[PDB]
Amino acid sequence: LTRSEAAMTVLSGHVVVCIFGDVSSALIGLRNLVMPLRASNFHYHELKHIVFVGSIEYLKREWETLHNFPKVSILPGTPLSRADLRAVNINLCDMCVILSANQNNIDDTSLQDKECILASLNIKSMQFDTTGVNIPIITELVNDTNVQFLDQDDDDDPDTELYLTQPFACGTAFAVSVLDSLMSATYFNDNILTLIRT
Amino acid sequence: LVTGGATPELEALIAEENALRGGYSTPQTLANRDRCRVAQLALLDGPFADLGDGGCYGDLFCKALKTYNMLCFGIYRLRDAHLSTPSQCTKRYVITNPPYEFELVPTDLIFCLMQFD
Amino acid sequence: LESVSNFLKDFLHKDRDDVNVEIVFLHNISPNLELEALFKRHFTQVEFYQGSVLNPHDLARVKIESADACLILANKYCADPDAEDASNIMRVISIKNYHPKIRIITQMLQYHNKAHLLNIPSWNWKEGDDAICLAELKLGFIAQSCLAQGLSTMLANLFSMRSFIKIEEDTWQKYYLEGVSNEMYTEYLSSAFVGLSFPTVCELCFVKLKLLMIAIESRILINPGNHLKIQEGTLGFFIASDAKEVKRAFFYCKACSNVKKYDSTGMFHWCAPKEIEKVI
Ligand SMILES: [Ca+2]
Ligand SMILES: [Ca+2]
Ligand SMILES: [Mg+2]
């Protein structure tokens, strides 16, 4: 797509995916996110549309595994562009998903989730003819201590565990560090990994 | 003063769309042009030029303000103009807010804010 | 050492009035012996506490919930302007997250990063959040030197606090320093000047009070016309030697056609988007 066709194509109940890709960034593997939405125990009229916003270079470095799926679209823009997020009907989606690929290349532990946090704040600071705070949003963070910047009404404490933090308790944030108990669970009960996988 | 106006309307437009968008002419648009513009003017010709050698900055400030709705915050004076001997150097320097008693020389430039027509 | 030394010279200058605002520094590096000596030379006005601005515990330690404002200095000479802007953005995010209602003054190297920052939900420019963009202000000052050469020097010298310096030599430097001794101030002006024209109060203030007015508080009006009458309770943007002189402005009572030519706001010229080869 581009600005024109994105704005005139009415979208509602869709999934908006915000990608901070780069030509040197690692491959996220968006196949694994698309396939559960595309599963066949949903009727075809019930399939939520998917649109990806991000660097066109990174989209043409991953599209080679996403061309057999329906209801998908690309918009070659910036996840932080207010014009793009307005053109994509962000206020009418069933989810916005924010992912970053530049997480391992840099080693600062401060700027790893800066783009995701800024995008989340920009989406929550939007005025619609309702505010942007009620939008359904999920973001993936590399550092668990960065979850304190996602919300402002909640009380922040570095000692507080991620599972106990308000944005995680609400399903607004997700980090790969919560999966570490799957080693122990899998070992004790060999069927649990397949029950979860299915 | 520095960006030639950036009112909250323009700061919203550049935050939402990140480009200047062209507008059709309106009476409010033609009213928004009235704001002063910074200027230099010469002291060797025009209505101010009777402030030749030995004039007072207070006289110039007063007549400019009284008659042209114009006032000066400084003189762009030639570096060597305070010397007795002629020099080929054309370099000047900023004198800010000088006394009413401050002395003019005919080769000078004046910083001021001027009206719109 | 140089950043704090320059900041304290301008904040604590004798040309301001008798302000007793305490300065509290928050930094995660232990100060070297020369910074500790600089803080000892300011022992009653400066306190330092070692911590990270990203830590809510440290923010509570420096009592940022009751501070009048928070100032965020930036590394202008950094190797990576993008990295510096990102770090400053993170600092602003952390401070606003701890306390949304804190006045934040920060330096921003670029203008797109400034646009990125102003989307923060707690970022309120009306309340007093000022992002001083260095590239923007410097390019604006250079452009004003294209309308009148020397105006970048004229503007820059109005902010730096400077005392009068005088020497016996007859040199261009004496006159230049005498001009440099003045800064731009702001204060409320006497009821004795309400009901008069702006040119009239300017020619009155000029040498009787020894004060020059550039503007007044339809709010911010640069050099008003002769048709504007001074509102009761207004403030004047004076240029003066110091703050204790502009007190006179208060303390006085007769002590003698479909063409899109412009932008949407009507403030800049505009044209259709030209191709790059057209203008090459
Ligand atoms: Ca929080
Ligand atoms: Ca001074
Ligand atoms: Mg103390």
From Swiss-Prot, chain A:
Motif (Calcium bowl): 139-161
Subunit structure: Homotetramer; which constitutes the calcium-activated potassium channel. Interacts with RAB11B. Interacts with beta subunits KCNMB1, KCNMB2, KCNMB3 and KCNMB4. Interacts with gamma subunits LRRC26, LRRC38, LRRC52 and LRRC55. Beta and gamma subunits are accessory, and modulate its activity.
Ranges for region Segment S10: 168-188
Disease tied to this protein: Paroxysmal non-kinesigenic dyskinesia 3 with or without generalized epilepsy: An autosomal dominant neurologic disorder characterized by absence seizures, generalized tonic-clonic seizures, paroxysmal nonkinesigenic dyskinesia and involuntary dystonic or choreiform movements. Onset is usually in childhood. Patients may have seizures only, dyskinesia only, or both.
Family from the record: Belongs to the potassium channel family. Calcium-activated (TC 1.A.1.3) subfamily. KCa1.1/KCNMA1 sub-subfamily.
Whole sequence portion shown: 828 to 1062 of 1236
Function recorded in the entry: Potassium channel activated by both membrane depolarization or increase in cytosolic Ca(2+) that mediates export of K(+). It is also activated by the concentration of cytosolic Mg(2+). Its activation dampens the excitatory events that elevate the cytosolic Ca(2+) concentration and/or depolarize the cell membrane. It therefore contributes to repolarization of the membrane potential.
Distribution of this protein across tissues and organs: Widely expressed. Except in myocytes, it is almost ubiquitously expressed.
Free-text domain note: The S0 segment is essential for the modulation by the accessory beta subunits KCNMB1, KCNMB2, KCNMB3 and KCNMB4.
Protein's cellular compartments: Cell membrane
Residues that bind Ca(2+): Q148, D151, D154, D156
Residues covered by region (Segment S9): 10-30
Modification after translation (UniProt): Phosphorylated. Phosphorylation by kinases such as PKA and/or PKG. In smooth muscles, phosphorylation affects its activity.
Note: The protein was initially thought to contain two functionally distinct parts: The core channel (from the N-terminus to the S9 segment) that mediates the channel activity, and the cytoplasmic tail (from the S9 segment to the C-terminus) that mediates the calcium sensing. The situation is however more complex, since the core channel also contains binding sites for Ca(2+) and Mg(2+).
Signal peptide (residue range): none
Domain of life: Eukaryota
Protein name (record): Calcium-activated potassium channel subunit alpha-1
Record-annotated RCK N-terminal domain positions: 12-129
From Swiss-Prot, chain B:
Subcellular location: Cell membrane
Tissues in which the UniProt entry reports expression: Widely expressed. Except in myocytes, it is almost ubiquitously expressed.
Processing and modification events after translation: Phosphorylated. Phosphorylation by kinases such as PKA and/or PKG. In smooth muscles, phosphorylation affects its activity. Palmitoylation by ZDHHC22 and ZDHHC23 within the intracellular linker between the S0 and S1 transmembrane domains regulates localization to the plasma membrane. Depalmitoylated by LYPLA1 and LYPLAL1, leading to retard exit from the trans-Golgi network.
Note: The protein was initially thought to contain two functionally distinct parts: The core channel (from the N-terminus to the S9 segment) that mediates the channel activity, and the cytoplasmic tail (from the S9 segment to the C-terminus) that mediates the calcium sensing. The situation is however more complex, since the core channel also contains binding sites for Ca(2+) and Mg(2+).
Similarity comment: Belongs to the potassium channel family. Calcium-activated (TC 1.A.1.3) subfamily. KCa1.1/KCNMA1 sub-subfamily.
Known disease link: Paroxysmal non-kinesigenic dyskinesia 3 with or without generalized epilepsy: An autosomal dominant neurologic disorder characterized by absence seizures, generalized tonic-clonic seizures, paroxysmal nonkinesigenic dyskinesia and involuntary dystonic or choreiform movements. Onset is usually in childhood. Patients may have seizures only, dyskinesia only, or both.
Function according to Swiss-Prot or TrEMBL: Potassium channel activated by both membrane depolarization or increase in cytosolic Ca(2+) that mediates export of K(+). It is also activated by the concentration of cytosolic Mg(2+). Its activation dampens the excitatory events that elevate the cytosolic Ca(2+) concentration and/or depolarize the cell membrane. It therefore contributes to repolarization of the membrane potential.
Domain notes: The S0 segment is essential for the modulation by the accessory beta subunits KCNMB1, KCNMB2, KCNMB3 and KCNMB4.
Description of how the protein assembles with itself and partners: Homotetramer; which constitutes the calcium-activated potassium channel. Interacts with RAB11B. Interacts with beta subunits KCNMB1, KCNMB2, KCNMB3 and KCNMB4. Interacts with gamma subunits LRRC26, LRRC38, LRRC52 and LRRC55. Beta and gamma subunits are accessory, and modulate its activity.
Protein name as it appears in the record: Calcium-activated potassium channel subunit alpha-1
